[PDB]
């Protein structure tokens, strides 16, 4: 029998590491049916903020308007998604946006040749002014009430060194970008994770003793610390299994044909989450779990 | 199409979560049916995917002018040694998992980078 | 034409690393692999996006209609 308590007794989590961008952890004694649900929800269901509507006023660069708006949308924005609400696509496009669901970005820039460029100089930054348009150039225009709600933390790109465009003197770019909430299911730009995925814990069943110098080459057919040499007798054993990338170099030699079987632990998922920059991977996982729970709760409360 | 006459129309744009994912977290941008090869017999695409994966790993480029490899210096052996010395599989296979259900696929998937 | 904002396969923002890759290649005598590793690109899906970028926009820019030549 399976019960809530019979799962809660055996389920355990090991947070191997955690930065503000990447968190590598474990889910043990859970089924792939749920680990994959978590992975899918993280990749394509956690809301985020990216530029959606772009209002070009003047553009003369080599980059055409569609490509420029595409890049501006693709730029991740360090905004906490909870700070703003969702947009009603049924409403007219005049009143479809407000100050609590849309963040406004602007990019007004004109290139001009620098008169102080030394003779023989070929560096574009020396020759021209604003020859490069960076994501940091996207100013934030707080509107209405959001001027004091976002005062605690201004809106900036996650990576302000993204090369949005290049200019030459005379050429200018002027636009406004509207950033709304969205999920990676609609467009890949809204996905908060660079990539979230798991991998079954490798399992290395050593069938027979591998004493001798055969252990030296046996360990040599693995990542550096996967296998250790026993201190007392010259036997081989598995130090760490997470360290193994499953490359099967062992099976490539006729020596270990009947000395080891490589398998996996189907209840042991080594999750790996990297954030785009708007949120932290622990919060990404928390959001995914809350999303699955609230989806099931919505189905419960749905009259039939 | 690839550079080996392997044309084919884009059938459907598969969602990324539904795409199979590998142990390294990458999801291919192109899925090519394994049944394209037995009749067309473009082994060059296989060896190119091998060499492209190895080059993208090591940060190098490999020449593919015909007739540099011969019956002894097999390109499979060459680029397989290069693939093994970066931790990956000598045959270019990658343990991948199904993104639809979640379970691991039956065999190692053959992945690589091709132009 | 110009460096893509994100990696195609995973989505790791590689659009802010082209200038740094060029600097690590030019100033230091780094190999492309060493420079990409020191740039924070581990998956070869992300490595290829900077290893193989061509940057045709610089060639495009030499034809400026709005500046006397």
């Amino acid at each position: 029998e399976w019960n809530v308590e019979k799962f809660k007794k055996d389920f355990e989590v090991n947070i191997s590491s955690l930065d503000a961008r990447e968190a590598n952890f474990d889910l043990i004694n859970i089924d792939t049916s749920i680990a994959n649900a978590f992975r899918r929800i993280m990749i394509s269901e956690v809301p985020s903020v990216a530029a959606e509507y772009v209002y070009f006023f003047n553009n003369t660069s080599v980059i055409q308007d569609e490509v420029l708006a595409h890049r501006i949308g693709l730029v991740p924005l360090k905004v906490d998604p909870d700070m703003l609400t969702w947009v009603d696509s049924n409403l007219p496009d005049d009143e479809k946006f407000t100050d609590e669901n849309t963040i406004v970005l602007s990019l007004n820039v004109k290139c001009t040749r620098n008169p102080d460029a030394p003779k023989g100089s070929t560096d574009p930054k020396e020759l021209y002014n604003n020859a490069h348009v960076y994501a940091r150039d996207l100013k934030f225009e707080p509107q209405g009430r959001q001027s004091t709600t976002f005062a605690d933390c201004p809106v900036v790109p996650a990576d302000p060194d993204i090369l949005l465009a290049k200019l030459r003197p005379g050429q200018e770019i002027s636009l406004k970008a509207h950033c709304i909430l969205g999920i990676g299911g609609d467009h890949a730009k809204f996905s908060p994770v660079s990539t979230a995925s798991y991998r079954l814990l490798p399992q290395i069943n050593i069938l027979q003793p591998i004493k001798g110098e055969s252990a030296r080459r046996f360990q040599k057919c693995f990542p550096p610390g996967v296998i250790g040499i026993d201190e007392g007798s010259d036997e081989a054993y598995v130090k760490d299994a997470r360290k193994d990338t499953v490359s099967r170099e062992v099976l490539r030699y006729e020596e270990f044909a009947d000395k080891v079987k490589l398998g996996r632990v189907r209840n042991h998922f080594i999750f790996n989450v990297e954030s785009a920059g708007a949120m932290t991977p622990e919060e990404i996982f928390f959001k995914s779990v809350r999303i699955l729970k609230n989806k099931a709760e919505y189905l419960k409360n749905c009259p039939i | 199409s690839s550079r080996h006459g392997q044309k084919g129309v884009c059938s459907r744009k598969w969602p990324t979560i539904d795409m199979p994912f590998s142990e390294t977290g990458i999801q291919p941008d192109i899925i090519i049916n394994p049944h394209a090869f037995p009749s067309r017999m473009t082994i060059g695409m296989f060896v190119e995917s091998l060499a492209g994966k190895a080059g993208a790993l090591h940060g190098i480029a490999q020449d593919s002018t015909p007739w540099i490899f011969n019956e002894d210096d097999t390109p499979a052996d060459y680029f397989g040694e290069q693939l093994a010395k970066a931790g990956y599989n000598y045959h270019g296979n990658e343990p991948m998992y199904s993104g639809a259900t979640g379970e691991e696929l039956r065999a190692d998937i053959y992945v690589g980078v091709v132009y | 034409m110009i460096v893509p904002v994100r990696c195609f396969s995973c989505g790791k923002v590689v659009g802010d690393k082209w200038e740094s890759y060029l600097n690590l290649l030019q100033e230091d005598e780094l190999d492309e692999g060493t420079a990409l590793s020191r740039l924070g690109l581990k998956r070869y899906c992300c490595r290829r996006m900077i290893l193989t970028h061509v940057d045709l926009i610089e060639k495009f820019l030499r034809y400026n209609p709005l500046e006397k030549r």
Binding site: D244 | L57, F69, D73, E81, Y88 | -
Partner: peptide, 19 residues
């Protein structure tokens, strides 16, 4: 015939997640 020259300085560029 001279065999295709093996590249040098080749090291493990791939490691399991979290390492």
């Amino acid at each position: 015939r001279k065999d295709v020259p093996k590249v040098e300085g080749l090291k493990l560029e791939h490691f399991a997640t979290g390492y």
